Amino acid sequence: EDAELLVTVRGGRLRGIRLKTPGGPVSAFLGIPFAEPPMGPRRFLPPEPKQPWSGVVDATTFQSVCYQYVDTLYPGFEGTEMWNPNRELSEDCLYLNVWTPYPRPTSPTPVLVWIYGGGFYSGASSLDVYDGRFLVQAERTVLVSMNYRVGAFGFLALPGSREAPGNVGLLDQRLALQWVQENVAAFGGDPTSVTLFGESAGAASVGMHLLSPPSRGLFHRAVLQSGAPNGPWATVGMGEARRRATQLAHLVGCPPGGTGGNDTELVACLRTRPAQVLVNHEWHVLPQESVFRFSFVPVVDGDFLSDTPEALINAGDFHGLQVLVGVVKDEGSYFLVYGAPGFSKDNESLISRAEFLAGVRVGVPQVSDLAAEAVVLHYTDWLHPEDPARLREALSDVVGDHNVVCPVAQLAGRLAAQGARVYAYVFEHRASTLSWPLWMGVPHGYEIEFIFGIPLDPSRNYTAEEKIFAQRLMRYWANFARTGDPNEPRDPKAPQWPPYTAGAQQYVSLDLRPLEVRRGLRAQACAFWNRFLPKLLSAT
Amino acid sequence: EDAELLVTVRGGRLRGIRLKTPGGPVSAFLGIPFAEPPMGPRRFLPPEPKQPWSGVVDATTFQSVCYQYVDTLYPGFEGTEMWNPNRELSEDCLYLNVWTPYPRPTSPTPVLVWIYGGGFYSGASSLDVYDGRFLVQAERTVLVSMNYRVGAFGFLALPGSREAPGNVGLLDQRLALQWVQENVAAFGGDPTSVTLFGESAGAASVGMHLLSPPSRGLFHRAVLQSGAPNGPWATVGMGEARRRATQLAHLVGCPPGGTGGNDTELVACLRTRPAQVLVNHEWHVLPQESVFRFSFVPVVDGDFLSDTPEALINAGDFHGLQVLVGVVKDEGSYFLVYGAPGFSKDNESLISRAEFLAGVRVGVPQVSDLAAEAVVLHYTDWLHPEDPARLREALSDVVGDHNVVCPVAQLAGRLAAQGARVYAYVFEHRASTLSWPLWMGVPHGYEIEFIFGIPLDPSRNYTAEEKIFAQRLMRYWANFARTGDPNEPRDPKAPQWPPYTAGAQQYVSLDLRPLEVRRGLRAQACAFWNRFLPKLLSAT
């Protein structure tokens, strides 16, 4: 047995496993318990630290996926099922994973901490596209990723109550960050150089950790890929969170008619229900027909988030913080097949004008008829207001700008103007092996496999250019993790990545071509979402 | 003795004058009375036909300019003085002019009828840039132009009353069209081929003759240069027209202190005032601070205009009609020096952001704060929201699109989609002799001198290519007058001018270069003005 596959942490001993990459081995410690199993009376409660254990915990394989909805839109399709759970579901899921180089670093090494996305209702650290063996081998970094409770188990909230306070899934991530502080040195990791990175709901989580003081001390840099805490989907109000939790209780027979009412009797009834029963009614508590809206998300309650993310972003001091943010080329196209009329992954989705006007209401729920008119005005090409291909790309722009691109640009500009050093990108390469239709372009989430170096997997059919491209991206992310600057610390030959500033708004395009600098993250479109539309909603 | 300078019309005999051009002489009959002098009790009343006369009326020189405000913004400046009256002011001003080729045409020849602009408060057929000798010589058509009452004398209105019904200036133009029908044959002109063309308020007048049945029978084609009857400045409501007329009465002491003020006593008191006194208070009755707004304009009374121009445009059947419409490249820049803060013709007018925001309220008066926010949203470059040059061009676009380009675009599309054959242009040549500053671009009204072939004047310093350019334009205008199609009926080699359609929205650019076809008359900007902004004001 190799001695480096045995490690002692504060709770006991672990045995890891050695993973192969074409460039060399990596030591992995998969399935480390960092919290007590949040089961029975602990359902909906904040996590408690894992009590110390005797013997050697086996850390050679991923642990269970947290209970979550399983996507059935295209059964058997690679594009959807690559995100579905690949381990059995269980409420016993609070486990984390540590990848470390071989040989183990003798000097403290910067640490990357991955937070998976999935709309706060799904996701797992065990997904194949989150395999950290290639990023750790190529860049000699320590990589950590945790599981956190999603859906009702992580974010059902009766605000104010002690039995279901909400945001416990965010607290799971924090506890994992506290664990990295106390234990990552045992793997050769530097707890003074901890960079967070996450995609979609993981990116929003990273943002919410920036805005929560108890979390802000546990890390030093942030990477937000295609997501932001200020998004219209990433938070809900106290009243709406209470209404969703009460309706979920009703759908599963809580409280038993008609005995019950207060929050204590409601959560107690919810705690007796099998986990699969709660999952089976999760989507039915959404208030309207929509896409890119999720039932149980972080709640703005005054505790984890003392104010709304937008308020904390505006009032925040971010001096001494380095941030990397970005988006993919087609943020919205993915979501249209989940409810927008006329869309299908198996045809060209050449929608009609009427289907476009209906899709706007699904893509922008809970706006006045007048607000929808402004959206139609801004996203119609009035030289070709009936062209199906342009309408398809326009509805994609509507959903992507409203949910991802403009919340990210709002955040990136506020951070740079308030002390943070910001770098911005737009990912523009469509994977050659992508199974989604060509009209979706570079869809939401399909930069992750390049960040994690998946093209290096010899059992995959990526092109030679994509392997070089993945290595360049891993260098950018690692350089940012080590130094706070994605640019090569001294290489002047490679094109340079300028910081993002509220004035110049410079960002780079990430594709097979060398870096190219551009200005403005859809500046015209995002002025509509960030500046005008709120003023329109005020005066109804 | 040239006998062709002698003509008999229905009212008597006339003696014209021969005008010289570099290409040959032209016979001109300037100052033909077509109405009784609208003086004394006739002030504010519809015109009456000129009673027949004995002897030979001298028609060798232009008659008096109708009483009007004289522009004093830049005293002594060519750019402003070229529009001021160049003959004595008088209420005895209802005279028209006829140019005809030499030798007189023996066959009935198509007739161009010019209607001058000037915001319905100014203008005169005697202005040097309306000299018809070059258009008539080069293209062998008959040209007619009339004087019509402007300001209070043409458009003061107490709706309902008989003493000041309004729109009498439009009736003056109609009477001149009736005169052309009854008399233009005596000059070699074909009353079955009459093309109206006008600029600015003249273009708005031409449009209102399309929408008035009694006038619609007196002509066969329309040309609307930089103006439309549906503009926000071209008409006024009954209630507002009554308020303006009543305030004018108050400012000139009408009615006297302690006197009833029904419409009869008010107009009677107004008729006793010297004409210059009414002029001296004309601008004081505008309801708020503005540019491109005029005190006395056509009123939507139910008589001359049975409904609003917009309503009549939408419900109208225009089969059998050919229209030529167009705009200059920089419609708005001219007006900014008449009230927009920070603007001056003698500097670069590099306005600040605050001046831009103030200018929007002056350029778009009578809109809510939310409407102004939408205007700022649509016209700000949010990548350079403080750049003075871009803000200067943006406010020019605001004023020009709101007042000219979008009313013209809406009209052109409704005409083409409802039976009319339509041709559209954008005039993009800045005269080499233009005295206005370079930042104004191609300002409002500076295509007229090219349409009338003024570059051919030997006493002017136009370039050789501007002389050739002027000849192309006169050919386009005359071909449209003859056939209804500006394209050369012979030459297939010359670039073709496609009709404007509500779908393809094709137009051509007019400059020193050959014709270039483009699509959309600022389609994105005009969707804001024509589609969204009305919905925004309805919801207040």
Ligand SMILES: COc1cc2c(cc1OC)C(=O)[C@H](CC1CCN(Cc3ccccc3)CC1)C2
């Ligand atoms: C079952 O009902 C619904 C299911 C979904 C929606 C709405 C629904 O009801 C209307 C959505 O809007 C979802 C669309 C996302 C699902 C996950 N993928 C993949 C992905 C996962 C993690 C990171 C990045 C991409 C992207 C689109 C799912």
Ligand SMILES: COc1cc2c(cc1OC)C(=O)[C@H](CC1CCN(Cc3ccccc3)CC1)C2
């Ligand atoms: C004295 O008060 C005012 C005077 C004017 C305005 C506002 C005023 O008060 C705010 C305007 O908006 C006017 C601007 C026009 C004046 C004449 N020219 C020239 C022209 C004449 C005829 C056809 C084409 C061009 C174009 C702009 C004048």
